[PDB]
A paper describes a structure:
Upon locating the promoter, Eσ70 melts a ~ 13 bp segment of DNA to form the open promoter complex (RPo) in which the DNA template strand (t-strand) is loaded into the [name] active site, exposing the transcription start site. To help understand [name] regulation and principles of the regulation of transcription initiation in general, we used single particle cryo-electron microscopy (cryo-EM) to examine structures of Eσ70 alone, Eσ70 bound to [name] ([name]-Eσ70), and Eσ70 bound to a promoter inhibited by [name] [rpsT P2; Gopalkrishnan et al., 2017].
Analysis of the cryo-EM data for the [name]-Eσ70 complex gave rise to three distinct conformational classes. All three structures are essentially identical except for the disposition of Si3 [also called β’i6; Lane and Darst, 2010a], a 188-residue lineage-specific insertion (LSI) in the trigger-loop (TL) of Eco [name]. The second class [[name]-Eσ70(II)] contained approximately 33% of the particles and resolved to a nominal resolution of 3.8 Å. In [name]-Eσ70(I) and [name]-Eσ70(II), Si3 is in two distinct positions with respect to the [name], while in [name]-Eσ70(III) Si3 is disordered. To test if this alternative conformation [Si3(II)] is relevant to [name] function, we compared [name]-mediated function with wild-type (WT) and ΔSi3-RNAPs at promoters where [name] inhibits or activates transcription. Deletion of Si3 had little to no effect on [name]-mediated inhibition of rrnB P1 and rpsT P2 but transcription by ΔSi3-[name] was activated only ~50% compared with WT-[name] on three different [name]-activated promoters (pthrABC, Figure 3E; pargI, Figure 3—figure supplement 1B; phisG, Figure 3—figure supplement 1C). Three TraRG residues ([name]-E46, R49, and K50) are central to the Si3-TraRG interface. However, these same variants exhibited at least ~2 fold reduced activation at the thrABC promoter even at saturating [name] concentrations, indicating a role for the [name]-Si3 interaction in the mechanism of activation. These results indicate that the Si3(SBHMb)-TraRG interaction enabled by the Si3(II) conformation accounts for part of the [name]-mediated effect on activation.
Numbering used by the authors:
A (entry chain I): 2 to 1342
B (entry chain L): 512 to 562
C (entry chain M): 2 to 73
D (entry chain J): 347 to 789
């Protein structure tokens, strides 16, 4: 059940699993986040409404001067997108707010209002989001990478080991809020427990308990369990709770009933506790020595005196037992301490507690928060209440409360805003229990502690900071507040908020240039998480902790796609099915499980909600109904993974792909690659430059179509219909009768984007693929972009590789590319460089853009027209002129004998200095397009007038073609008027269309309908008169250029770089390479049938770097081209549709269980010929990533062709014509072309420009300056005895500004001497030391 | 920060210097004109020098 | 050499040293002990027969392992 | 530094190890001043401006002038991290079409430069002491001994070792078995004509020159029982060495001690010429081996399944004994990782014992086993790339991946790369792999 578009070539699809969650729209992060940002949102939640409800209303100094909020608006831009890339504006959208300045009357708190002046005030231009989540800030398409930062809540950290040298670990616990004072708990190595408010001094941690209305009795009964001792007529009985005695010294005879069930000295093993439980002991009679070290909880005083016998939390010695014996107590309370489990911590910290009771504790808090402030009753009350208990001065965000209740094993995920007695006490219990053995510590990386921002929330915060810095000014201008003379816009300033928001979108560690050199690059750049930036941890502070992968990445961030090198792991790329949760933490799909069934309901899980479940594994064969095939299946429960019984799973992975990203899920046979290698593979697939004829992955992974379509490059049909008029520019879809709106149907039209620059200087082209008179279904591609083909992402080209050494040309990783790959121009990649030539305004005068140039005859000026700009199309080369420009330079200041010379030949020395924009030395191109911006203070020249006329012709053509469709829709609606009630069918197609307004009709509601539709027609008329007026006026106006520039002339060269020894190349699995000798055809190897193997890689790179996936891909490719050549023979020897059907059907079934059966008996006889003609280059093959095609499937798919099952053909060398012993592997591997081109990298500099502060080399153009002869190189030269080369390496070649010119004079005059002198850098050092008062001089002898 | 580690003063090129081609041409032409004035007389060479 | 080759060497180093630590722990050589090195209880047959020459009863082992779980 | 450049490098084995390629354009832009001087000296352009315009047009005679000023003018190639004093070396230029600074292959190990896009920077020595120092202090043929130890740093690296190892090995019944030859030369006339295969045991009459006669070379001929590979290679050995230098099977350690002996016995000139010759003949006979790798090469032991069955049986036994309360959690953890490491070593040894001796073939009689010619094996044995551990990962089970902390996880990868990996096993592998990169990129 396929469409008519999908049948262009139906990708053979292995992969055994059924997909149950189709791939989400890959750009959900950017789009949905910026959608939450900018929208009138009738609820106080996120969006701009959040910021405005936060900072407004502004009340003055209580003076009945208020400025409140009403509602805002997003006026449409003045320049739309492509206009805004041409000209250079920020694709903004002017903001508007309805602020409402109210002024209450004095002698009135809320008495009668005296003025409510309601006026709408401008502020800022928020740069809107394109349809592809890519803003346009200054002409270039920029992208704001999602950030990943610590969620405000609670954290229990270790800081294990190194401190204190005893090895003993500390267990600190931090309560970070959204906004307010922190709170920390920590152990000392002496094991007492201490607190600290915001990172200030430590404190005896019981002081905060006491400050919260806790005296020692209830402290000890919160942080401890009770053991009562009894004095029942003889010597110190004890309560026996049976499980109190696991792992403890038996320092006494544990008898019972006068029977000995446990004996002294031993240890109470589980046997003993078992037997005491079975033998029912409850009150054991132990000696006094065992109470001698116990601790007494409650307070005891002589009941006859009221004098304090034992304070709370004192150790009972024998004397105190005696003393309270004579007071009439048979109950005694003792803390159940223990070295293992119920440790003494709060008790011994009370030992450390200097203070005694509540008021003293509040005093100490007041003296630790701020010194010098004398303590006080109410000062202490206010300070302590306002640390953690002030709704104004402290608020966990609701995210804060949610983490704080999920990390305590609480109940409600949402609740209060400030802390409480119970929140603090639960923190402390959790802390002590962490240290007691039960419980564990949340390591940093755990994605339950990495809330994900994105464009929306970050821009919201920047607008927030803007609002605070402006409400300062608002309250200030309200200080002087005249009641009714300042409207609600002189209080504000617009440029503040615009400054903040532009600073974010244009200067950030996030808002960065789109890696727009390959559709996979954009859609793997917009899906991106970053841990750097403002508010995240940067490298120095942190640090190795967050580089790591952590088992909560399984389906939430890709593990095998992260930028290797300087910052690994800080650029985690988001998974395939991942999402941002409601609160923010990354979440992912999982299929629900009933009693024992695998439901098809996908259910989302965040990070903190997972471990309490037990998730199955997607690689589980299930039994045609939703029951597993076994009773025990692999699963993963809490980090660990293991076998579980069938009746225990709760969640199955949505699909085998979800562990990866869109980066590494395109690598076919990813499953057989060492993870570093898939890392480098994805990170070299993000850089493939779009070739000239982008072919297709001959072996793909299923996700490639979704990446091509969901990225913006393909030209996706908005509505299904017939194709009326294709063309290299535009595609005209005639919408069908059912997908067609009721009024003014019309037809959809797509203006493609022909040749044009992207940021990385490549060609972002679009070519139609659906030809004239041809159906298209909704949601289908019309026009392939760069590196797409038929809507299947084709980054590089497939080609014939043969693994074999072949004379050292591929030594380390080098590659040997036969000239059949470069003759065809199949890696010939097109690069569209932009050269600008401004025309500035110096003190001497304005630069000219004349065609009149000195010291260059007609020679270099043959390509220039009458005005100094080159023609569109002249094939400039290295060193020619594109824009003739001359600057007036007075004071020629003639010299000696040069003056004699001018006398000798009378040649008038000109007043003008040539500065024309000449092509960079080396490129060789075609000037595809010249644009001339002009300050509107200059008379536009002749060529700019040509350009204005031409663009205006174009825009007139376009907008008139638009008006035609529109009026056709309105005539349609007119017929829809007549069709009901008195339509005259054939009396309306004969006569002219324009004379339908005067068509007869009875004066019912339908005559008034005709009148109304005539009104609509004339409105459209005047509308497009005035709209073409506005188009002509946008074109005709001057530009608004930088300060002091007359006119800029942009010239778009279009180089075509082919391929040449040095151009890096690479497969997908991470086999790099540097194509190293572009061999003839004859020389290459050739299999017994004749075909020369185009590339020749190296065998020594498959075992050493375990990326055997490239050998399996090579074999699947060889089988694929086997099928291809079989269809080619069946089609060239032209057979029929019948043989083709039987053979393609044999290819598409092919054995093992698959989810792809197509049944070509429904393809019409003429579709299968088209299907063949698209397969005649070779049958594509899918292979979902961790669910690929196992080897034996490949072997049978080879045997379906006629290749040898071994995969290894016997090759004959091309030069000697004699068989390679030991057959080689040959196949069709898909190889990219990385854009580390050679001619971008090559560089050489003999005498260029120079610096200005130190006479060193400095060039610009391609760092047109010498290589850095750094320090380690100087160590090298000193290691050799060579010292002359060093002396000239930093005296003659580099700095000594007489040494270098004398060296050049000597070199030209054929005397290789050198006259060093002394470096100008050291002379600067003498001056910089001497400006300080340090007289450094050089002795002279 | 877009590079290894630079400061914007490290890029501001120079314009007082003379391209060492110019230095070589000026010297070569000093020598050549010296020879050409060798192709005149005392009155001739001295007058054209002093002129 | 490449940047993944060096990472392979480091991964070999890391897992080899970890595994060889944990094989250094387990004894596999008899020194028949017959009752604890701390508590004195008899070590049962099954435990002394799995791990030959193990000085400590089961409970003493769990207890020392738990005091060491907080890393000394 | 004025007068420099840099670019992407490549291989170009057609060189001798004292000279590097250098592109025409980079040459003409490094040596502009010398070229200008040479032009106005030979009178082909009147004044320096005219010479400038000539080299800027790239006329016909500038190339000849440049091929004169690049005759004996050594340049200095350098790399980016110049660890030790061999990071900078002289080379003579060889003018090249293109844009890649072609580098002699034996020089890589000194530079520690692979050819996957690592860029090299060429400096040019100006003065005449500078050229004399490039020729007698920094030339590539005067740094063969690493400064950190007297052993050579011109050890052939990877394709050449596989070339020699496939050249000088021996199967048991190939063509030309047991026939007799009258020298290395007719061994070559055999092999290149297709009568006797490259390695097949033969008798030859080699002639090794020992030099106990002080600096003198006493000839001595014999009948070595050797192969056709060894006798074909012996022509490249200089006079000094003895014949037992090549009579073995020439791994990488043995091939480096070949050069080390040649340097200790004859000096620096013959050892340079011999490094060049070994590299050439190794490249040729490796390109002739056709030594390709393929997916059928990685022979899983059929016995791997039994080893892993018993491994998981013993782990389940420890599991039962953990639920019975007979071993603490720590001791069961260590017993599990123990029995898995034991299974890992058993599977490794069984695969290697099925992979190395697997060639059992038949000489004029019943049969015999011999060291295998298994492509992945020779690439792991000769010393070209990898060793027993990486092969262990392509055929046996692949170890126990260990998370970055150190506490090696106890769910071992029971699979390998020839077989697939299911998602758990891969997601475990990621821990150790990303740790490896994150350290040797901070390094
Ligand atoms: C009247 C008709 C209403 C829709 C039925 C109008 C609306 C837009 C018109 C087409 C467009 O201009 C594009 C195209 C331009 C070519 O150059 C000339 C042909 C095309 C096919 C035009 C024919 C026709 O005139 C169209 C369909
Ligand atoms: C390439 C480099 C950024 C690399 C990241 C950019 C960043 C700013 C650029 C300079 C400034 O524009 C000032 C100045 C303008 C003159 O008109 C032309 C020269 C100058 C020095 C520029 C050269 C170069 O373009 C610079 C260094
Ligand atoms: C990783 C490193 C290679 C990198 C260069 C290799 C080379 C030497 C190896 C150690 C030593 O053999 C000593 C010791 C042998 C024991 O038996 C097992 C462990 C030990 C610690 C080994 C760890 C590791 O395997 C080392 C560091
Ligand atoms: Mg490198
Ligand atoms: Zn014990």
């Amino acid at each position: 059940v396929y469409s008519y578009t999908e049948k262009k070539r139906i990708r053979k699809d292995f992969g055994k699993r059924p997909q149950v969650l189709d791939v989400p729209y890959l750009l959900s992060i950017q789009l949905d986040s910026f959608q939450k940002f900018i929208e009138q949102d009738p609820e106080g939640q996120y969006g701009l409404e959040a910021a405005f409800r936060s900072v407004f209303p502004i009340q003055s100094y209580s003076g009945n001067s208020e400025l409140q909020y009403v509602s805002y608006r997003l006026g449409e831009p003045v320049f739309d997108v492509q206009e805004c890339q041409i000209r250079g504006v920020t694709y903004s959208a002017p903001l508007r707010v309805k602020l409402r300045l109210v002024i209450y009357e004095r002698e009135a708190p809320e008495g009668t209002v005296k003025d409510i002046k309601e006026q709408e005030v401008y502020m800022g231009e928020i740069p809107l989001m394109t349809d592809n989540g890519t803003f346009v800030i200054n002409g270039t398409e920029r992208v704001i990478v999602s950030q990943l930062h610590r969620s405000p809540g609670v954290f229990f950290d270790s800081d294990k080991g190194k401190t204190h040298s005893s090895g003993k670990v500390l267990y600190n616990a931090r309560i970070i809020p959204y906004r307010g004072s922190w709170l920390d708990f920590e152990f000392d190595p002496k094991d007492n427990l201490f607190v600290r408010i915001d990172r200030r001094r430590k404190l005896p941690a019981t002081i905060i308990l006491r400050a919260l209305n806790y005296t020692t009795e209830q402290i000890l009964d919160l942080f401890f369990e009770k053991v009562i001792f009894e004095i029942r007529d003889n010597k110190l009985q004890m309560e026996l709770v049976p499980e109190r005695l696991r792992g403890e010294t038996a320092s006494f005879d544990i008898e019972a009933n006068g029977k000995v069930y446990v004996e002294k000295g031993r240890r109470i093993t589980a046997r003993h506790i078992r037997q005491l439980e079975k033998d029912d002991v409850k009150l054991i009679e132990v000696p006094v020595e065992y109470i001698a070290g116990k601790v007494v909880a409650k307070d005891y005083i002589d009941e006859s005196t009221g004098e304090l016998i034992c304070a709370a939390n004192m150790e009972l010695s024998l004397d105190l037992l005696a003393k309270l014996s004579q007071s009439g107590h048979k109950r005694i309370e003792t803390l159940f301490t223990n070295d293992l489990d119920h440790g003494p911590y709060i008790s011994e910290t009370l030992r450390v507690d200097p203070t005694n009771d509540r008021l003293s504790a509040l005093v100490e808090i007041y003296r630790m928060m701020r010194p010098g402030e004398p303590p006080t009753r109410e000062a202490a009350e206010s300070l302590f209440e306002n640390l953690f208990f002030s709704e104004d001065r402290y608020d966990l965000s609701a995210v804060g409360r949610m983490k704080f209740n999920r990390s305590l094993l609480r109940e409600e995920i949402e609740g209060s805003g400030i802390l409480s007695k119970d929140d603090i006490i639960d923190v402390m219990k959790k802390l002590i229990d962490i240290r007691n053995g039960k419980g564990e510590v949340d390591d940093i990386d755990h994605l339950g502690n990495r809330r994900i921002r994105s464009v929306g929330e970050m821009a919201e915060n920047q607008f927030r900071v803007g609002l605070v810095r402006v409400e300062r000014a608002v309250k200030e201008r309200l200080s002087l507040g005249d009641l009714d003379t300042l409207m609600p816009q002189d209080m504000i300033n617009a440029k503040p908020i615009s400054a903040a928001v532009k600073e974010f979108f244009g200067s950030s560690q996030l808002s960065q240039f789109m890696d727009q050199n390959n559709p996979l690059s954009e859609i793997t750049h917009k899906r991106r998480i970053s841990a750097l930036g403002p508010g995240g941890l940067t490298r120095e502070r942190a640090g190795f902790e967050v580089r790591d992968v952590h088992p909560t990445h399984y389906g939430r961030v890709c593990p095998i796609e992260t930028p290797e090198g300087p910052n690994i792991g800080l650029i985690n790329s988001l998974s395939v099915y991942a999402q941002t949760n409601e609160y923010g933490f990354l979440e992912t799909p999982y299929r629900k499980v009933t009693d024992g069934v695998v439901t098809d309901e996908i259910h989302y899980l965040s990070a903190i909600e997972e471990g309490n479940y037990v998730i199955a594994q997607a690689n589980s064969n299930l039994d045609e109904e939703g029951h597993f095939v076994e009773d025990l299946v692999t699963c993963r429960s809490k980090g660990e993974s293991s076998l579980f019984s069938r009746d225990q799973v709760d969640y199955m992975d949505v699909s085998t792909q979800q562990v990866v990203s869109v980066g590494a899920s395109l690598i076919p046979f990813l499953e057989h690659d060492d993870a570093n290698r898939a890392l480098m593979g994805a990170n070299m697939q993000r850089q493939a430059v779009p070739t000239l004829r982008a072919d297709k992955p001959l072996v793909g992974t299923g996700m490639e179509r979704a990446v091509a379509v969901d990225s913006g490059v393909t030209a996706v049909a908005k509505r299904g219909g017939v194709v009326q008029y294709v063309d290299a520019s535009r595609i005209v879809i005639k919408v069908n009768e059912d997908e067609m709106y009721p009024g003014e149907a019309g037809i959809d039209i797509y203006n493609l984007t022909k040749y044009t620059r992207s940021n990385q200087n490549t060609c972002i082209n679009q070519m139609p693929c659906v030809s004239l008179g041809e159906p298209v279904e909704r949601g289908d591609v019309l026009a392939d972009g760069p590196s797409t083909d038929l809507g299947e992402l084709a980054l590089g080209q497939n080609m014939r590789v043969a693994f074999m050494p072949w004379n050292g040309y591929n030594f380390e990783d080098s590659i040997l590319v036969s000239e059949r790959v470069v003759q065809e121009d199949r890696f010939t990649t097109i690069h569209i460089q932009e050269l600008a030539c401004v025309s500035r305004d110096t003190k001497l005068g304005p630069e000219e853009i004349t065609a009149d140039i000195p010291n260059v005859g007609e020679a270099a000026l043959s390509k220039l027209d009458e005005s100094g700009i080159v023609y569109i199309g002249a094939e400039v080369t290295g060193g020619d002129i594109l824009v003739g420009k001359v600057t007036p330079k007075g004071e020629t200041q003639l010299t000696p004998e040069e003056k004699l010379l001018r006398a000798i030949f009378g040649e008038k020395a000109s007043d003008v200095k040539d500065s024309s924009l000449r092509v960079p030395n080396g490129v060789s191109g075609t000037v595809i397009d010249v644009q001339v911006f002009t300050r509107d203070g200059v008379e536009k020249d002749k060529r700019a007038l040509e350009i204005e006329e031409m663009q205006l012709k174009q825009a007139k053509k376009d907008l008139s073609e638009e008006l035609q469709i529109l009026e056709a829709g309105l005539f349609s609606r007119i017929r829809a008027v007549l069709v009901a009630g008195g339509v005259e069918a054939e009396k309306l197609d004969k006569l002219p269309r324009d004379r339908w307004l005067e068509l007869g009709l009875t004066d019912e509601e339908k005559q008034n309908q005709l009148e109304q539709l005539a009104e609509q027609y004339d409105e459209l008329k005047h509308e497009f008169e005035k709209k073409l007026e506005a188009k002509r006026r946008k074109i005709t106006q001057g530009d608004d250029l930088a300060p002091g520039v007359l006119k800029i002339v942009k010239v778009y060269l279009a180089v075509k770089r082919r391929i040449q020894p040095g151009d890096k190349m690479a497969g997908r699995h991470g086999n790099k390479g540097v194509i190293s000798k572009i061999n003839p055809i004859e020389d290459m190897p050739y299999d017994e049938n004749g075909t020369p193997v185009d590339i020749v890689l190296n065998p020594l790179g498959v075992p050493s770097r375990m990326n055997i996936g490239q050998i399996l891909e090579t074999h699947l490719g060889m089988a694929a081209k086997g099928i291809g050549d079989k269809i080619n023979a069946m089609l060239k020897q032209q057979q029929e549709v019948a043989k083709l059907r039987e053979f393609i059907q044999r290819a598409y079934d092919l054995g093992a269980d698959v989810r792809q059966k197509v049944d070509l008996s429904t393809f019409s006889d003429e579709e299968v010929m088209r299907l063949a003609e698209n397969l005649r280059k070779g049958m594509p093959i899918a292979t979902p990533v961790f669910d690929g095609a196992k080897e034996a499937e490949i072997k049978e798919l080879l045997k379906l062709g006629d290749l040898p099952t071994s995969g290894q053909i016997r090759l004959y060398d091309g030069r000697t014509g004699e068989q390679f012993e030991r057959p080689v592997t040959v196949g069709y591997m898909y190889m990219l072309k990385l854009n580390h081109l050679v001619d971008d990298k090559m560089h050489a500099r003999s005498t260029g420009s120079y610096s200005l502060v130190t006479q060193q080399p400095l060039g610009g153009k391609a760092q047109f300056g010498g290589q850095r002869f750094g320090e380690m190189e100087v160590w090298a030269l000193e290691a050799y005895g060579a010292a002359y080369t060093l002396q000239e390496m930093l005296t003659v070649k580099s700095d000594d500004v007489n040494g270098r010119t004398k060296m050049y004079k000597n070199i030209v005059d054929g005397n290789h001497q050198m006259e060093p002198g002394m470096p100008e850098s050291f002379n600067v050092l003498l001056k910089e030391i001497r400006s300080l008062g340090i007289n450094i001089e050089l002795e002279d002898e | 920060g877009d590079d290894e580690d630079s400061h914007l003063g490290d890029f501001i090129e120079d314009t007082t210097l003379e391209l060492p081609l110019d230095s070589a041409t000026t010297e070569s032409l000093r020598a050549a004109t010296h020879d050409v004035l060798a192709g005149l007389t005392a009155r001739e060479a001295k007058v054209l020098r002093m002129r | 050499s490449d940047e993944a080759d060096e990472a392979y060497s480091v991964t070999e180093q890391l897992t080899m040293t970890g595994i060889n630590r944990i094989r250094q722990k387990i004894n596999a050589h008899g020194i028949p002990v017959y009752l604890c090195e701390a508590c004195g209880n008899p070590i049962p047959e099954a435990r002394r027969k799995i791990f030959p020459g193990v000085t400590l009863c089961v409970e003493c082992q769990a207890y020392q392992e738990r005091q060491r779980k907080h890393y000394a | 530094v004025d007068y420099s450049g840099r670019s992407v490098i490549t291989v170009g084995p057609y060189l001798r190890l004292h000279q590097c390629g250098l592109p025409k354009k980079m040459a003409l832009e490094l040596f502009k001043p010398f070229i200008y001087g040479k032009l106005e000296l030979r009178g082909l352009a009147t004044t320096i401006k005219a010479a400038k315009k000539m080299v800027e047009r790239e006329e016909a005679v500038v190339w000849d002038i440049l091929d004169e000023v690049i005759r004996e003018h050594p340049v200095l190639l350098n790399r980016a991290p110049t660890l030790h004093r061999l990071g900078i070396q002289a080379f003579e230029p060889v003018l090249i079409e293109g844009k890649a600074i072609q580098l002699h292959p034996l020089v890589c190990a000194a530079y520690n430069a692979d050819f996957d896009g690592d860029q090299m920077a060429v400096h040019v020595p100006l003065t005449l002491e500078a050229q004399l120092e490039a020729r007698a202090l920094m030339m590539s043929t005067n740094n063969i001994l690493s400064p950190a130890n007297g052993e050579p740093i011109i050890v052939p690296s990877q394709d050449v070792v596989l070339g020699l190892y496939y050249m000088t090995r021996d199967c048991v019944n190939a063509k030309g078995e047991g026939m007799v030859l009258t020298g290395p030369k007719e061994a070559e006339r055999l092999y290149r004509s297709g009568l006797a295969s490259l390695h097949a045991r033969v008798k030859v009459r080699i002639t090794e020159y020992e030099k106990d006669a002080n600096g003198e070379l006493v000839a001595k001929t014999s009948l070595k029982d050797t192969t056709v590979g060894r006798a074909i290679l012996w022509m490249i050995v200089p006079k000094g060495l003895p014949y037992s230098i090549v009579n073995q099977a020439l791994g990488k350690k043995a091939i480096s001690k070949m050069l080390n002996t040649c340097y200790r016995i004859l000096g620096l000139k013959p050892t340079v010429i011999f490094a060049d010759q070994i590299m050439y003949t190794g490249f040729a006979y490796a390109a002739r081996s056709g030594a390709s790798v393929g997916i059928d090469d990685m022979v899983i032991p059929e016995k791997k399944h039994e080893i892993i069955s018993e491994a998981e049986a013993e782990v389940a036994e420890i599991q039962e004994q953990f639920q019975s309360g007979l071993v603490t959690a720590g001791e069961r953890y260590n017993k599990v990782i123990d029995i898995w490491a034991a299974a890992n070593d058993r599977v490794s040894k069984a695969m290697m014992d099925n992979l190395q001796t697997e060639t059992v073939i038949n000489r004029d009689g019943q049969e015999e086993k011999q060291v295998s010619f298994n492509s992945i094996y020779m690439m792991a044995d000769s010393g070209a790339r990898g060793s027993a551990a990486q092969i262990r990962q392509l055929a046996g089970m692949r170890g126990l991946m260990a998370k970055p902390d150190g506490s090696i996880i106890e769910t071992p990868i029971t699979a390998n790369f020839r077989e697939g990996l299911n998602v758990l096993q891969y997601f475990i592998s990621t821990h150790g792999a990303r740790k490896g990169l994150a350290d040797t990129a901070l390094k």
